[PDB]
């Protein structure tokens, strides 16, 4: 029927979507800025739809409760019809691909290690072979699921430690994990996606850094409810933006163009 305003679900995660300094002075979409904000505008223009940016209610990416089988986060908002599309650093995973549609990836990444500068850790193997330095991941995300499901010796060992570590090594938001790294004097290391790791390394106080190679390789995709008529155009738009070098341009804009660590 008649075209409707597309409800976009996203998440406050720097530098993808951030509240503008003067957000209280603004309305609707103008309140936000970031890589995914710019991306949303581009996708909307190439697909010919108008939209409304909304921040996921529970502030989560998306995981299924082992008992209720209920999905939370952005994935849940799509599954239960609360949102028409998710434009955020949402990792393409098998369990998610089965319940929602994903465009081809618009950004690539891999799980990585964030340490406070000077921390005597160079790899995941280093972390797994010691206990003085605690380490964890984000909750309700793909990184935690990666360790939970891995049969790779080193990652299995890490998961075995993290799952029963006390106090908890898991955090509710990336900002929390970063804060813990910064305020733990090198006694806490954070496992997060290289993309977020790289961004933080260029932010003051410039006291963190990515160490070692990525643990895996994957990407973020724009998600729509399974079977959504929007999926097709969105996917083609992602490819066009990729081929025009627009995606690369947006990453440089939000990651390095204005890096604060030289």
Ligand X SMILES: N[C@@H](CCC(=O)O)C(=O)O
Q: Which of 56, 230 has the CB closer to ligand X?
A: 56
3-state secondary structure 192-206: EEHHHHHHHHCCCCC
Is the Cβ–Cβ distance between 124 and 155 less than 8 Å?
yes
- Say if CB 224 and CB 85 are below 8 A apart: yes
Size of the residue set binding ligand X (CB under 6 A): 10
Q: For residues 196 and 183, what is the distance between their CA atoms, to the nearest angstrom?
A: 18
Interface stretch with a second copy, choices 19-27, 113-121, 216-224, 253-261 (CB under 8 A): 216-224
Residue 150 interacting with ligand NS3 (CB under 6 A): no
Residue 209 phi, psi dihedral angles, 5° rounding: -165, 155
CB-based contact 102:96 (threshold 8 Å) = yes
Choose the one of a second copy, ligand X, ligand NS3, none that binds residue 20, judging by a C-beta under 5 to 8 angstroms depending on kind: none
Asked if 34 is part of the footprint of ligand X (rule: CB under 6 A), the reply reads no
Interface with a second copy (CB under 8 A), residue from 164, 245, 260, 262: 245
CB-CB contact of 112 with 135 (8 Å) = no
- Identify which of 212, 215, 98 has the alpha carbon closest to the alpha carbon of residue 149: 215
Shortest reach from residue 220's CB to a second copy, in Å: 12
Q: Quote the least distance from Cβ 91 to ligand X, whole Å.
A: 4
Q: CB-based contacts of 193: which residues, under 8 Å, 6+ apart?
A: 89, 91, 109, 110, 111, 112, 143
The answer to whether residue 104 forms part of the interface with a second copy (CB under 8 A) is yes
Dist CA 226 CA 205 (whole Å): 42
φ, ψ of residue 137 in degrees (nearest 5): -140, 180
User: Which span (77-85, 136-144, 147-155, 248-256) binds ligand X, by CB under 6 A?
Assistant: 136-144
221 is a site residue for ligand X (CB under 6 A):
no
b/e code 143-170 from CB counts within 10 Å (16+ = b): bbbbbeebeeebbebbbebbeeeeeebb
Does 189 bind ligand X (CB under 6 A)? Our answer is: no
Q: Between 65 and 104, how does the x/- string for binding to ligand X read (CB under 6 A)? A: ------------------------xxx-------------
Q: Minimal distance in Å, beta carbon 242 to ligand NS3?
A: 4
Choices 47-55, 68-76, 194-202, 235-243 (CB under 8 A): range interacting with a second copy: 235-243
Q: Is 208 annotated as a binding residue?
A: no
Binding residues: 89, 91, 96, 142-143, 193
Binding residues for ligand NS3, rule: CB under 6 A, are 92, 104-108, 217-219, 239, 242, 247-248, 251
């Amino acid at each position: 029927g008649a075209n409707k305003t597309v409800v976009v679900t996203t998440i406050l995660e720097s530098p993808y979507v951030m509240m503008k300094k003067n957000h209280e002075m603004l309305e609707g979409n103008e309140r936000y800025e970031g890589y995914c904000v710019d991306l949303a505008a581009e996708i909307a223009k190439h697909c010919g739809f108008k939209y409304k940016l909304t921040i996921v209610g529970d502030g989560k990416y998306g995981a299924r409760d082992a008992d209720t089988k209920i999905w939370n986060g952005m994935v849940g908002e799509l599954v239960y019809g609360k949102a028409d599309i998710a434009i955020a650093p949402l990792t393409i995973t098998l369990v998610r691909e089965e319940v929602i549609d994903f465009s081809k990836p618009f950004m690539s990444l891999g799980i990585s290690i964030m340490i406070k500068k000077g921390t005597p850790i160079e790899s995941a193997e280093d972390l797994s072979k010691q206990t003085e330095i605690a380490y964890g991941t984000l909750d309700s995300g793909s990184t935690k699921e990666f360790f939970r499901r891995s049969k790779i010796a080193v990652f299995d060992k890490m998961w075995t430690y993290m799952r029963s570590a006390e106090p908890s090594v898991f955090v509710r938001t990336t900002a929390e994990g970063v804060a813990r790294v910064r305020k733990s004097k090198g006694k806490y290391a954070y496992l997060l996606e290289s993309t977020m790791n790289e961004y933080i390394e260029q932010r003051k106080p410039c006291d963190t850094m990515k160490v070692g190679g990525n643990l895996d390789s994957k990407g973020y995709g724009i998600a729509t409810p399974k079977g959504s008529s929007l999926g097709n155009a969105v996917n083609l738009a992602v490819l066009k933006l990729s081929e025009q070098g627009l995606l690369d341009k947006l990453k440089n804009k939000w990651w390095y163009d204005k890096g604060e660590c030289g």
